[PDB]
Amino acid sequence: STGSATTTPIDSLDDAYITPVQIGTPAQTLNLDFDTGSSDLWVFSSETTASEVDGQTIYTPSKSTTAKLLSGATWSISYGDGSSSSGDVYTDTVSVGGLTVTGQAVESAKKVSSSFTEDSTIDGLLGLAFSTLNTVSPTQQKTFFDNAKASLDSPVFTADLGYHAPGTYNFGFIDTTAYTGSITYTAVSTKQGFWEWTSTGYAVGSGTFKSTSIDGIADTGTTLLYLPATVVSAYWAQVSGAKSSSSVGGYVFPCSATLPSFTFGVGSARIVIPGDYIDFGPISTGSSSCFGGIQSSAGIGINIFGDVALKAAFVVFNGATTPTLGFASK
Numbered sequence: 243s244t245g246s247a248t249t250t251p252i253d254s255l256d257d258a259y260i261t262p263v264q265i266g267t268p269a270q271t272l273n274l275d276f277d278t279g280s281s282d283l284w285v286f287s288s289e290t291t292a293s294e295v296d297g298q299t300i301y302t303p304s305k306s307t308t309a310k311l312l313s314g315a316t317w318s319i320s321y322g323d324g325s326s327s328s329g330d331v332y333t334d335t336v337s338v339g340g341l342t343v344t345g346q347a348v349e350s351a352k353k354v355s356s357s358f359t360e361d362s363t364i365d366g367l368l369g370l371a372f373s374t375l376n377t378v379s380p381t382q383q384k385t386f387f388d389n390a391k392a393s394l395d396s397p398v399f400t401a402d403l404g405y406h407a408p409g410t411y412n413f414g415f416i417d418t419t420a421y422t423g424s425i426t427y428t429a430v431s432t433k434q435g436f437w438e439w440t441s442t443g444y445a446v447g448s449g450t451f452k453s454t455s456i457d458g459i460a461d462t463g464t465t466l467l468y469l470p471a472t473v474v475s476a477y478w479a480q481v482s483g484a485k486s487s488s489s490v491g492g493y494v495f496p497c498s499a500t501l502p503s504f505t506f507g508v509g510s511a512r513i514v515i516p517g518d519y520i521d522f523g524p525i526s527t528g529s530s531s532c533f534g535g536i537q538s539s540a541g542i543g544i545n546i547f548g549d550v551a552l553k554a555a556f557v558v559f560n561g562a563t564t565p566t567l568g569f570a571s572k
Contacts, residue, residue: 243393244414245341249276249403252363255522256549257465259403260363261411264337265348266306272299272365276411277463278401278437278559279546281375281385282319283336284327284349285366286358294354297362303350309334317349317377322464322542325357331378336386338368341413343390347376347383367463370399370559375435387413387561397561401462402572403553405519421556421570426511430565434544436461437559439567441547442509444469446477447502451512458545460552460559460567466522467504467515467550468539477504477536484534490525493534497524504536506551508569515554 249261260273265285272285286295288302303309309332318328329352336346351366358364369376373384391397394414402410402420410420431438436459445451456469474493478484480502484495495501501517520535535550558568 243341243390244395244412245337245339245390246410246412247339248408249411250408251404251406252361254406256403256406256553258364259409259462259549260365261338261368263368265301266303266334267308268306269337270299270301270306272301273363274366274368275364275463276368276370276401277461278370279459279461279463280319280321280367281369281371281373281435282317282349282377283347283366283368283386284317284319284329284351286354287329287350289329290351291353294359296359299365301348301350301366303332303334303348306334308344309348312347312378312381315347315378315381315383317379319377322546323357325355327351327354327358329353331383338386338413339411341390341394343386346386346389347378349378370462371437372432372435374432387559390414391561399559399561401552401557401559403462403549405516405553409553416558421572423571425556425558425568425570426508427558427560427566427568428508430567432565436544437565437567442507444473444507445505445512446480447517449480451505451507453507456506456545458539458547460547460557462549462552464546464548465550466546466548467520467536468542468546468548469536470545471538471540474536474538477502478534486538490531490533492537494525494531495534497530497532499532506547511569513551513555513569513571515551519550519554
């Protein structure tokens with residue numbers, strides 16, 4: 243089997259992407275944030291504290307003839323941005339772009355933090371990291387990909403995120419028309435439960451490539467590119483007027499600037515992030531100070547290849563017995 247679904251930016255900055263997901267019988271379609279940095283599929287629901295729902299589409303398990311309470315199971319998660327959610331668990335039928343999993347754990351939110359409430363466009367998350375990170379207790383549950391894997395034509399999914407435009411998540415096949423040149427594959431460590439890999443270096447604009455190992459995670463659920471302070475300083479030093487602002491919470495730059503590209507290494511290959519991808523617009527409405535899309539990972543404890551990086555590539559998440567990651571230009 244295979245699946246193919248379009249993923250759409252939630253706003254004009256590409257702050258996140260949503261992908262329609264069919265849950266239950268008859269189908270209830272929710273727009274979920276596919277997140278290769280976590281491993282819970284959770285949804286706004288009829289069980290969510292009413293004051294914490296503001297415009298989201300909810301899953302109502304009592305209206306699904308295939309929903310079954312997973313007795314005793316609870317979940318609770320906190321994300322790297324400080325947001326959180328928790329609740330109980332159902333199993334139900336879940337389909338993504340034509341690919342169907344029966345018995346998928348669907349984590350129903352009873353509580354969500356303000357960040358989720360305030361984002362009307364995201365109805366929940368669909369985790370695509372390794373199932374070892376799944377928070378369901380006392381019986382850990384598998385991700386959608388893990389459940390689908392054996393049935394897939396090939397045990398892979400691909401992320402093809404658009405810049406200011408829709409893109410695609412494919413399951414079970416590699417669309418050879420979706421990228422240019424060849425795909426370069428690189429080793430993955432699953433020890434922390436992430437799609438963790440080592441970039442071979444970077445360049446700033448037309449500058450020379452610096453060969454240096456950068457350990458990081460491929461994370462579709464993180465907006466920006468978080469890299470070591472040395473790397474990030476080298477980038478923003480090429481932008482007149484750019485500075486790190488403690489009050490704003492990162493590097494800002496004059497909105498009048500033209501940003502240089504940023505290149506990262508995948509083995510001997512190179513992925514180029516155009517400068518425009520690194521512009522996240524005014525820090526506040528009407529400001530001439532703009533927020534940068536490359537930020538320091540210092541104090542996160544891990545480097546994160548988020549959407550800013552991944553949207554410059556066609557990315558293969560290879561879930562074979564020994565997982566790997568592939569990157570192609572597009």
